[model samples]
Target: DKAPPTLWSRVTKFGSGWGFWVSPTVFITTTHVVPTGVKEFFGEPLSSIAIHQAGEFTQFRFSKKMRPDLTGMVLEEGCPEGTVCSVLIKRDSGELLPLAVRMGAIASMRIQGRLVHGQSGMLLTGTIPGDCGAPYVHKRGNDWVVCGVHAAATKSGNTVVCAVQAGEGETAE
Candidate 1:
C-alpha cells in the first residue's frame, strides 16, 4: 500500500494543510496553521510547539519563529532515517510539464495581498477548502519537486484555480 507517505501524516489537524520534514530538528508549515492569536491554545509553556507527525502526536520545546505566512519549528530530536527534503521551484514554463500536455497558465497572483513572482498563478484541475499550506508539486527528473504552496483559490467560469505562493517542500533552512 502507498499508505500516503510519512509526510501526509504530518499534516495539521482536520487535514487543513500539509507540511514536510526540513531537517533533523525542523519541520515547515504555513504561519497561518498556528495563528498568533491562538498559538497558545494548547496551554503549553511558551517554549514548546505542538505538532502531529509520523503516526504520532507530539510537541517541540526548542526554538521557533512565527511569521505571517511561514513557520519553522526546531525539535529536540531529528527526523527519522531516510527522510528527504522537498525541492522548491521558482520559475514556471512549458518546460516544467510533460510534452504535448498543456495546462492553463497563471494570469495574475498574489500572496497575503502582495503580488509575488513565479508563473503568475495556476488553474489547478483539483482544489478544495482547507488546503492552505499544501505543496503543489511537479515531476522533475522522476522526483516530485515543489512548484508552489497552496494558499487560497477562487472560482472562474466553473473552473477553480489555485493561487500559489513561491515556496518549496520542506524549508531548506
Candidate 2:
C-alpha cells in the first residue's frame, strides 16, 4: 500500500491492490488477486522494519489493521443548511467512518454535519507527527480506510502532529 492511486491504476482494473502491510515494505499478496495473472510476483511477507532498516531506508511505518473511528471531519461540498458534525468509524473492512465534531460550524458555513477537519491527512497543517503508528478508524461513501494510525497528534494544540499521505517521490516504504 506504499503506492498511490495513480500507480495502482496502472497495475490492474481496480488499480488498488488487495494486499496488507504490517509495516512499511512488508506486504502479502492477497488471495483476492491470485487469479489476476499479473506479471509481477509477490513474495512471502517480510518485516518491513528489518529490510528497510538494513538498507537504511528512513520511512514511516503503516498498519494492516485499520481503526477508522478514532476521529475526523466531513466537509460536504456545500451544505447551505450547514455542515453536519460527525465521527467516522468502520467496523470491518471497507467501512464508512463517522465524524467527531469538536465545534459546530457557523450558520454562514452551512455546515450541518459535524466539522471533522482533523481526521484524514494531517489533523493540523505544519505539525510533524511524533508517532508513526497511531490508529484512526472511519468509513466514507461505501469505502473504509484506517483514517488515523501510524502518526501522532497534538490533540490540544492548534497544530496537530499526525499522519499524512507522502507527497510525490516521498516514499513511506
Candidate 3:
C-alpha cells in the first residue's frame, strides 16, 4: 500500500488544452485544466469572465446559464498494451481529427477514495502542454470507446510521455 502520486491538476500550472463533448450540451475536461467551479480557476474568477467552449468554429459563453449540474456517460476502460489507439483532436472543424497513437503502459493512483488511472505512451501528445482532455479512442466494431483522456506530460528519453486520465474502471479486467 502506498500514497497515490499527485494528479495532473496539481502538476499543471494552468489550463491550456482541449476537452471533448460527451453529449450535445456536455463536454468532459479536467476541472484542473478548465475550471468549472464558481470559485477561482487558476487566479481568475469565473464571475468576471466566461469560459468560451468552441464547437465547429463556433464559440459560446458558458456559466450558470448552462447549468453545471453535470452529467455524462462514463467511458469504457482498457486498451490492450501495444494496441494502437486514436486521440481525437479539436480544431476549427469541430469534428476532431483522429490521431494514431499507441498505449505502452498503464498506471494508477488512488484519490478521493476513488480510482484514478493513466496511460503512459510515447506518441500520444503534442509539442507542448494543453492538449489536456482529449479522448483516447479504440474502436470496437462500429462504436468508438473512450478509454482515457490525455492528462499530463513529461520527457522520457527523446520522446515525451503523456499521462492519460480515465474514468472509474481504469484497470482492465
Candidate 4:
C-alpha cells in the first residue's frame, strides 16, 4: 500500500480560504459558500450570517454535536481554568457583551454539509473539520472564562473533512 499524501491531498483539499480567529470568543469557519445541511446541524438559522460576507456578525448558535465539558468547549489561555466562554461582540462603545451562542458544556462538535472542489458538491461519509484554534471552555463560577481554542480540525476534530454520512444504512437477512 502507498503512504497517504500530505493531509492536503489525501482526504479533503481545503483552499487557502477557511478563516479563523480568537480573543473575541468566536471562531469564523468560512468557506467559498455556506453549507445548507451544515447550518441545520449547528442548529443555526439559515441565512442568518451565511449571507453576510467579509465581515463580523452577532454571535449565532454553535455546533450542535459539539461537546460540553467547558474544556472541549471554549479555547483560550490565561483564563484561570474552570471557566466557560461565550461569544461576545465588542463595539466601539467598549461595552463587552456576551451573545447566546451555545449552552451548557460543549463535549463534541460536528459540522454538517461541506464544500468540495470549487465549493460545489459535498464530501459524504468523510472526516469532519475541527475547530481550528477555538477555545474549549471551563466556567469559573459567575465569571465565564477561557479554556483554549483547538489547533485545527485535525488536532481538534481528528479529521479535516466534514461529518456527512452518505447513503442510508439498513438491515439485511
Candidate number with greatest lDDT: 3
Q: After superposing candidate 3 on the true structure, give the runs of residues whose Cα lies further than 4 Å from its correct spot.
A: 1-15, 24-26, 36-74, 91-97, 109-116, 124-127, 156-173
* Model 2 weakest 10-residue run by lDDT: 51-60
Q: Each model's C-alpha lDDT?
A: 0.34, 0.26, 0.46, 0.26
Sort by TM-score, best first.
3, 1, 2, 4
Q: List the residue pairs that clash in candidate 1.
A: 24-78, 106-121
Give the 10-residue window scoring lowest on summed lDDT in candidate 3. 1-10
Better of 2 and 4 by TM-score: 2
TM-score of each: 0.41, 0.25, 0.51, 0.21
lDDT of 3 by residue, 86-148 (tens): 666454333335556777766563333534455655664442355556566666664555556
Q: Candidate 4: where are CA atoms >4 Å away? A: 1-127, 152-173
Cα RMSD (angstroms) for every candidate in the order listed: 12.7, 16.1, 11.8, 19.4
Ranking by lDDT: 3, 1, 4, 2
**Which scores higher on TM-score, 3 or 4?**
3
